[PDB]
Amino acid sequence: PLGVKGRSVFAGMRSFIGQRLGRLYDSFYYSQSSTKYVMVFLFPAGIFYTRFRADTKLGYHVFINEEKLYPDYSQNYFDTKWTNGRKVYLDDETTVEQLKAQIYGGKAAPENVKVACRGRVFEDADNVAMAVRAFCKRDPRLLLFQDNL
Amino acid sequence: RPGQGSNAQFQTSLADKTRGLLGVGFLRPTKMASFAATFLLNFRFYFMYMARTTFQAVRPLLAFSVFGEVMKLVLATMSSGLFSFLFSFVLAFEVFYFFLQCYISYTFLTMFFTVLF
Amino acid sequence: STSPGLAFANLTLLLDVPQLPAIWAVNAWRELNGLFTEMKTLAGTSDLLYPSNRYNPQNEKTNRMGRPRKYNHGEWMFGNSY
Amino acid sequence: GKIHGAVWRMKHLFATNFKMVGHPRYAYALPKNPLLQ
Amino acid sequence: QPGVVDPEAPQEVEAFKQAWHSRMGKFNDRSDTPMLYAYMNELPSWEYYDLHRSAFLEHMTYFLVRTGGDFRFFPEMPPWQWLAHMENL
Amino acid sequence: IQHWNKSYEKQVYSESVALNRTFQARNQLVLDRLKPSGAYRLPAVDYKRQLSRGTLVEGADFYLPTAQEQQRLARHFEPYSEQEQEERRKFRFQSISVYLAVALGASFVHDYFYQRRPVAWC
Amino acid sequence: LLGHTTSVTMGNSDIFFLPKPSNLLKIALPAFVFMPNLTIFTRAFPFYAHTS
Ligand SMILES: CCCCCCCCCCCCCCCCCC(=O)OC[C@H](COP(=O)([O-])OCC(O)COP(=O)([O-])OC[C@@H](COC(=O)CCCCCCCCCCCCCCCCC)OC(=O)CCCCCCCCCCCCCCCCC)OC(=O)CCCCCCCCCCCCCCCCC
Ligand SMILES: CCCCCCCCCCCCCCCCCC(=O)OC[C@H](COP(=O)([O-])OCC(O)COP(=O)([O-])OC[C@@H](COC(=O)CCCCCCCCCCCCCCCCC)OC(=O)CCCCCCCCCCCCCCCCC)OC(=O)CCCCCCCCCCCCCCCCC
Ligand SMILES: CCCCCCCCCCCCCCCCCC(=O)OC[C@H](COP(=O)([O-])OCC(O)COP(=O)([O-])OC[C@@H](COC(=O)CCCCCCCCCCCCCCCCC)OC(=O)CCCCCCCCCCCCCCCCC)OC(=O)CCCCCCCCCCCCCCCCC
Ligand SMILES: CCCCCCCCCCCCCCCCCC(=O)OC[C@H](COP(=O)([O-])OCC[N+](C)(C)C)OC(=O)CCCCCCCCCCCCCCCCC
Ligand SMILES: CCCCCCCCCCCCCCCCCC(=O)OC[C@H](COP(=O)([O-])OCC[N+](C)(C)C)OC(=O)CCCCCCCCCCCCCCCCC
Ligand SMILES: CCCCCCCCCCCCCCCCCC(=O)OC[C@H](COP(=O)([O-])OCC[N+](C)(C)C)OC(=O)CCCCCCCCCCCCCCCCC
Ligand SMILES: CCCCCCCCCCCCO[C@@H]1O[C@H](CO)[C@@H](O[C@H]2O[C@H](CO)[C@@H](O)[C@H](O)[C@H]2O)[C@H](O)[C@H]1O
Ligand SMILES: CCCCCCCCCCCCO[C@@H]1O[C@H](CO)[C@@H](O[C@H]2O[C@H](CO)[C@@H](O)[C@H](O)[C@H]2O)[C@H](O)[C@H]1O
């Protein structure tokens, strides 16, 4: 005897969802605290953040020409030295000045520092995304150098 | 009451109830970190297994292709009749060796693709 | 259950099925961004908007590539220069 | 092929027995013999 | 099912039962080649009492006295009230 | 030695009392409130407890849904009705004709609708 | 015809037909397992997948 008169398939769906959620809560309650919190919140959250950032934002590999231009990361922890080839995720509204400040930690940067991609110098009042689109399409490798000349 | 004698001993302090709410000796973030580390380290077994599986799967392909290339070099270089008479037996041995490798691969693959449930 | 020969599938599952929620979220976010862009276009814009393009910086004082517009200091009889 | 072999053996081992009218696990359902007593 | 003439034979039935038990054991049991026994910090009742025979005795005597009853009704997991009273005693 | 070890035991038991107090508090505060009702409990019993109860069954990796299908080997006289026999007589062999037709249709679709690739033109 | 040369498409040509004579065979044959059974022991799969 499938179905009952007066009851709706939507009510059945609601009841089934309630059953599933109650069973999930029971199974989460009767579980190890060492594993469940991690496997249910911390790995999903990190995976979600990483995937969303990768599939939504757009990143650039940053290099610096000379060692004397490297920033001072001695104080901040978990990164005590600059490494070239660093992946940096940015927003579509970011400019070259904002990128430079983010690199040098909002501190006094060297003089006549400029950004290039594939040998082509960017203006400081230029959008990084559009400048890359124009000069180095699908090759976002940026280089910070000193323009004395 | 039946259980009042026991429930009278259950009188906690403010600090005790705060510590219980926080879960000091029952959450064990060090245990959680140990579990995470062990779980991430346990990913090496997948790589080991896939390596073994691929090796056992390509073993016959190797026996059939690279030793075949060697035999083909020998055929391309040899002209006389005595050496050819002697090399025919090497070819037959390669046949038998290919069948042996196929048997070994069949055995290891039925071992690696056998599931209880 | 499983076996050594299923290491490929086990790894693929463990590393991919947790990403499906994020993939669906990305798809939903893209849909919402498209909806907002189309609503803005319907409302009206000085310069056009490219729908399927990453970024649209064009305005009355900015080109479609993020640079200032040339010859935009004065006014023109035919209105906008674009 | 497995099914074929199974049926090919069932033929030889059942079709000429006179004792396997069905499977022994279901002999309770057979009528009762009027010759036994 | 196997391609044998009589799969409903007692030999087949007993073989299936033994395979069933061996599989379930190899999967669930605590052994030197464990499948499921892994990442254990909070043990279930059975394994806990099998590893700690001292607690089984105490938790059992308390159950028979606190509630005059048979071992056949021994609870799966004891209450925290009982545990605390045991610790005080 | 003696005194230090006995004091070690005494402080061990002090720590035990502290742990017990916080355990009681944790339970009666959080867990007695978050405890599930039991309506959505697990609808099964462990195989060990079933074996002790004398209730475990191991067999029938398959099943037979309908009683018409369950009682075939017991009927002994009409395992299949007449209509069912007439229907079964239509599948004495596999249909290579249907195989061929379906395979040709699927190949046509898969090749000329789903697997089209560009080709140069000079 | 700059952006119209990659649009000239030709379909594939494979035919998926092979007679299956089973009357010739009387033995079973081995078969692969392609995916792990997630319908059983679903909750423990991440914990026992690395074993054998
Ligand atoms: C943002 C933070 C995110 C973090 C998470 C936050 C929380 C979110 C919710 C959790 C989401 C994760 C879900 C994990 C559940 C599975 C893994 C697990 O650990 O479960 C253990 C957990 C505890 O299990 P246990 O303690 O080991 O034993 C108790 C049994 O489970 C007790 O079993 P039972 O007796 O109560 O009932 C039997 C049970 C059986 O469950 C099981 O035991 C195993 C289930 C199998 C899982 C894998 C199956 C994969 C099958 C392959 C699919 C191939 C399809 C091919 C189709 C071809 C046709 C063209 O039935 C089911 O629930 C399964 C139904 C779905 C199976 C569908 C398979 C196809 C059949 C279609 C049937 C018809 C549709 C249903 C109609 C119902 C009426 C409306 O399992 C459960 O609680 C119930 C099973 C899970 C059911 C699904 C619950 C809803 C999940 C929603 C997912 C949506 C996520 C997306 C969110 C949006 C993001 C943008
Ligand atoms: C536009 C809308 C959307 C598209 C839908 C298009 C239209 C379809 C609508 C849906 C179906 C029709 C609905 C109305 C039916 C109304 C009539 C009716 O009620 O009865 C049916 C109607 C009459 O039924 P009947 O009254 O009971 O009498 C039937 C006859 O007595 C005959 O009975 P029989 O026992 O003698 O069976 C004959 C059988 C004979 O038995 C066999 O099948 C043996 C051969 C099997 C080959 C291996 C099978 C592999 C299956 C893979 C399937 C996926 C492939 C991917 C798909 C694209 C392939 C390119 O031959 C077949 O018919 C099956 C052909 C399977 C396709 C062939 C694929 C190529 C195989 C390649 C093998 C060679 C590999 C090496 C290649 C290298 C060559 C140099 O006949 C049929 O239409 C049969 C249906 C065929 C379906 C396929 C067979 C089932 C196989 C399942 C495979 C897994 C599929 C999973 C499904 C999706 C997941 C849930
Ligand atoms: C021994 C055996 C004897 C055999 C005898 C044979 C001689 C008998 C005569 C028949 C000969 C066979 C003809 C085969 C087709 C023509 C050859 C071919 O395939 O060329 C490739 C060529 C491929 O097109 P393409 O642009 O180069 O690239 C294709 C890519 O997929 C493009 O890539 P894309 O990314 O742009 O994707 C676009 C795609 C997008 O597609 C989709 O997104 C989804 C597709 C729809 C899925 C369903 C969704 C539901 C909505 C549709 C609802 C349809 C059901 C109705 C529902 C009503 C309720 C609302 O759009 C389509 O592909 C549309 C496909 C159109 C299908 C609908 C046409 C009716 C189908 C039924 C015809 C039945 C003929 C039976 C013949 C008898 C055989 C025994 O085909 C076409 O150009 C389109 C075909 C247009 C129909 C022409 C029909 C006339 C020719 C046949 C004459 C007989 C007419 C009989 C009519 C009967 C009433 C229906
Ligand atoms: C869309 C692509 C699907 C392709 C793959 C899936 C297979 C294709 C076949 C359809 C899949 C769904 C089959 C459902 C079968 C269950 C029928 C049934 O009666 O179940 C018992 C329920 C509960 O019934 P009941 O308990 O209320 O009353 C009847 C009680 N008995 C059974 C005792 C008589 O019945 C229903 O109400 C219908 C449920 C099915 C309808 C929903 C489909 C489920 C799939 C979606 C999952 C997500 C749910 C949330 C959706 C929210 C929508 C906004
Ligand atoms: C084409 C694709 C086909 C493939 C199929 C794709 C779909 C199906 C894929 C499923 C396979 C993967 C399933 C793995 C599931 C593992 C996750 C898991 O079980 O968690 C680990 C924990 C581990 O528990 P455990 O550590 O005690 O024991 C695990 C196993 N042993 C004993 C061996 C260690 O599992 C649980 O106990 C809970 C699981 C159910 C809950 C699932 C998460 C949702 C929770 C929501 C409730 C939140 C309540 C919050 C309340 C807070 C206050 C109390
Ligand atoms: C759990 C699953 C386990 C799976 C285990 C898998 C391991 C074994 C896999 C080996 C597969 C090798 C087969 C492909 C190589 C042959 C290609 C071919 O047919 O050439 C065209 C052959 C030879 O053609 P030809 O040489 O006369 O001329 C044309 C050749 N071409 C087209 C290439 C130019 O076609 C035939 O006419 C052959 C007919 C005779 C039968 C030959 C088959 C037997 C020899 C191979 C046995 C290998 C399996 C041994 C298994 C042992 C297990 C105990
Ligand atoms: C319960 C339903 C859940 C369904 C899933 C819904 C999506 C949930 C996540 C939405 C995240 C919203 O948060 C927002 O994300 C987008 C994309 O990263 C960011 O936006 C970023 O990408 C877009 C596209 O260029 C621009 O806004 C800008 O380039 C940049 O800032 C915002 O800075 C951030 O504030
Ligand atoms: C006799 C009638 C039988 C009814 C059959 C009806 C089936 C209709 C289903 C057609 C679905 C085809 O789906 C479509 O396949 C073609 C490949 O050919 C793909 O085609 C794609 O690749 C080709 C080749 O690079 C390019 O033209 C282009 O990049 C793109 O169109 C489409 O991305 C896909 O959307």
Side-chain angles (χ1 to χ4, degrees):
Chain A
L2 308 184
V4 63
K5 191 168 66 178
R7 192 158 192 256
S8 190
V9 305
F10 313 114
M13 287 196 299
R14 180 181 181 182
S15 69
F16 179 74
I17 296 298
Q19 295 168 9
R20 294 302 106 210
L21 297 176
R23 180 73 201 107
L24 287 174
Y25 178 71
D26 187 307
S27 186
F28 181 84
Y29 184 91
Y30 294 114
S31 298
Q32 293 199 83
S33 295
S34 311
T35 70
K36 69 194 186 187
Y37 295 108
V38 170
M39 185 64 66
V40 174
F41 295 106
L42 307 188
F43 289 165
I47 294 163
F48 191 105
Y49 179 76
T50 300
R51 184 79 187 197
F52 198 82
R53 183 184 61 179
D55 301 352
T56 296
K57 299 183 104 186
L58 63 188
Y60 310 85
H61 291 283
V62 177
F63 307 76
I64 292 171
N65 192 276
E66 292 169 345
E67 198 279 281
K68 85 197 192 71
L69 295 168
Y70 290 5
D72 183 67
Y73 290 170
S74 301
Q75 293 296 322
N76 65 327
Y77 287 103
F78 267 101
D79 50 353
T80 176
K81 190 76 197 313
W82 171 267
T83 43
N84 279 343
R86 258 185 182 184
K87 187 74 169 292
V88 174
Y89 289 93
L90 304 174
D91 305 70
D92 300 354
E93 304 80 67
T94 307
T95 60
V96 173
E97 297 290 57
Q98 302 176 24
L99 169 63
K100 218 180 289 176
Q102 178 174 341
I103 290 296
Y104 288 99
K107 313 208 300 184
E111 305 78 357
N112 306 318
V113 170
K114 291 189 168 55
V115 187
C117 199
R118 188 149 285 264
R120 301 160 197 200
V121 189
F122 299 176
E123 289 186 331
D124 304 330
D126 274 6
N127 183 265
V128 173
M130 312 311 294
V132 170
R133 191 187 198 268
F135 296 121
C136 54
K137 190 72 155 58
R138 298 173 62 85
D139 189 70
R141 294 173 299 197
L142 308 184
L143 182 77
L144 276 63
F145 68 101
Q146 208 180 23
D147 190 337
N148 310 284
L149 214 57
Chain B
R1 285 282 180 273
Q4 63 185 5
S6 174
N7 289 18
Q9 291 179 351
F10 304 153
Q11 307 294 8
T12 60
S13 170
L14 197 155
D16 283 327
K17 57 182 71 187
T18 314
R19 206 165 57 193
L21 191 154
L22 296 180
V24 165
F26 310 98
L27 301 178
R28 307 214 275 272
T30 184
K31 294 286 183 181
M32 305 213 302
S34 173
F35 151 76
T38 311
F39 178 82
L40 297 173
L41 269 298
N42 291 130
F43 270 67
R44 62 190 184 279
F45 294 102
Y46 304 112
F47 296 102
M48 297 172 181
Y49 295 153
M50 64 173 55
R52 284 157 54 76
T53 302
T54 57
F55 172 54
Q56 294 298 338
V58 304
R59 173 192 297 269
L61 185 67
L62 302 190
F64 203 78
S65 294
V66 311
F67 303 159
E69 275 284 38
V70 175
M71 298 291 123
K72 288 181 175 201
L73 280 170
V74 179
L75 292 173
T77 59
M78 81 189 189
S79 298
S80 65
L82 184 59
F83 185 89
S84 310
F85 183 84
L86 299 171
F87 186 67
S88 57
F89 307 112
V90 176
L91 294 169
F93 174 91
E94 289 294 344
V95 176
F96 282 97
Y97 189 80
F98 167 78
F99 278 114
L100 187 73
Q101 298 292 300
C102 285
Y103 169 78
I104 290 164
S105 73
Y106 171 87
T107 296
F108 277 104
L109 289 176
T110 185
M111 280 166 58
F112 299 165
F113 286 93
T114 291
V115 302
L116 304 179
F117 309 85
Chain C
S1 295
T2 143
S3 58
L6 300 170
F8 304 92
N10 292 332
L11 194 71
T12 305
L13 293 164
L14 293 174
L15 297 182
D16 295 1
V17 308
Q19 300 184 1
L20 298 181
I23 291 161
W24 304 338
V26 168
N27 299 124
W29 174 252
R30 290 173 178 161
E31 277 222 43
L32 295 174
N33 291 25
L35 181 69
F36 300 158
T37 304
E38 190 61 24
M39 286 171 58
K40 176 157 54 174
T41 298
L42 292 167
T45 42
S46 186
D47 198 2
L48 54 81
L49 296 179
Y50 297 116
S52 299
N53 288 36
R54 181 73 192 193
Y55 189 51
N56 282 284
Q58 52 266 16
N59 69 70
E60 293 75 1
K61 296 288 170 188
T62 306
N63 268 342
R64 301 175 185 177
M65 304 301 295
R67 296 284 194 83
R69 294 186 183 275
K70 292 185 77 66
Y71 316 136
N72 197 36
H73 179 277
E75 204 66 9
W76 194 30
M77 54 185 295
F78 291 103
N80 290 331
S81 311
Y82 43 81
Chain D
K2 185 177 73 171
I3 297 165
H4 190 304
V7 179
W8 176 70
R9 297 185 178 94
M10 288 175 188
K11 183 174 69 175
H12 289 85
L13 301 187
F14 296 164
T16 53
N17 196 323
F18 297 81
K19 305 176 57 48
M20 302 190 66
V21 307
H23 194 260
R25 282 177 59 93
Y26 306 89
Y28 64 87
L30 283 178
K32 289 181 277 187
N33 192 339
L35 311 179
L36 303 184
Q37 57 84 45
Chain E
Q1 290 290 84
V4 297
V5 64
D6 197 342
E8 295 185 1
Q11 293 80 235
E12 275 54 72
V13 172
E14 182 57 23
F16 185 87
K17 293 183 178 182
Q18 295 301 325
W20 195 95
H21 283 288
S22 62
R23 293 151 48 196
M24 299 298 287
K26 180 171 173 52
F27 180 70
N28 286 287
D29 279 61
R30 162 175 47 79
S31 173
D32 305 329
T33 315
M35 280 187 169
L36 185 70
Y37 196 90
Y39 313 105
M40 277 291 151
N41 310 129
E42 306 184 358
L43 303 169
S45 306
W46 200 95
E47 302 291 358
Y48 182 92
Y49 291 136
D50 185 12
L51 298 176
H52 311 285
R53 308 303 188 85
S54 168
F56 172 75
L57 191 68
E58 302 163 6
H59 296 186
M60 170 53 93
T61 59
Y62 194 93
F63 164 73
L64 299 170
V65 182
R66 173 59 175 281
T67 72
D70 297 329
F71 67 102
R72 294 174 294 117
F73 293 79
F74 184 61
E76 196 162 65
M77 50 175 291
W80 61 273
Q81 302 87 337
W82 297 13
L83 291 167
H85 199 200
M86 288 187 228
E87 293 298 341
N88 298 337
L89 301 168
Chain F
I1 305 180
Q2 302 174 354
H3 305 61
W4 286 38
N5 294 34
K6 299 165 78 67
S7 299
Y8 293 160
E9 293 211 68
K10 180 53 54 169
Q11 282 92 75
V12 168
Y13 298 9
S14 177
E15 292 186 356
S16 305
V17 167
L19 177 59
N20 182 12
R21 293 177 184 174
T22 182
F23 166 81
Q24 299 170 29
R26 176 176 69 95
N27 265 271
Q28 69 189 299
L29 286 178
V30 193
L31 305 182
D32 292 67
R33 302 187 191 181
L34 270 46
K35 198 175 176 57
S37 51
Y40 309 111
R41 64 192 303 179
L42 196 154
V45 179
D46 59 84
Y47 77 101
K48 297 186 167 179
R49 195 167 289 112
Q50 270 167 351
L51 197 71
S52 70
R53 291 170 169 186
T55 271
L56 187 71
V57 182
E58 304 88 347
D61 270 3
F62 62 101
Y63 81 134
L64 302 158
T66 314
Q68 183 67 8
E69 304 162 359
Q70 298 163 4
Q71 303 301 341
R72 295 203 196 281
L73 267 47
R75 277 182 260 162
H76 273 107
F77 271 91
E78 201 74 333
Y80 301 93
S81 65
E82 301 296 343
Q83 199 278 350
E84 204 162 3
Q85 288 182 9
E86 303 328 71
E87 294 290 359
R88 309 246 305 169
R89 290 184 214 292
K90 300 187 303 203
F91 308 106
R92 298 185 295 208
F93 314 94
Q94 293 163 239
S95 191
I96 198 180
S97 305
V98 170
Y99 180 16
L100 182 69
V102 174
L104 291 173
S107 300
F108 184 83
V109 175
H110 175 73
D111 296 314
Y112 301 99
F113 287 91
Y114 285 94
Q115 288 291 326
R116 307 191 66 89
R117 282 168 180 84
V119 170
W121 195 324
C122 320
Chain G
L1 285 52
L2 170 48
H4 302 281
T5 50
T6 56
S7 300
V8 175
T9 49
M10 304 207 70
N12 201 29
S13 59
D14 295 0
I15 288 169
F16 306 109
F17 176 79
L18 188 68
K20 195 190 74 64
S22 58
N23 46 27
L24 295 170
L25 195 74
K26 283 178 195 173
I27 55 166
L29 299 177
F32 289 96
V33 181
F34 301 96
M35 297 270 286
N37 204 340
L38 309 175
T39 66
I40 188 175
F41 310 138
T42 316
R43 202 186 69 153
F45 170 76
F47 306 92
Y48 73 79
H50 65 279
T51 72
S52 57

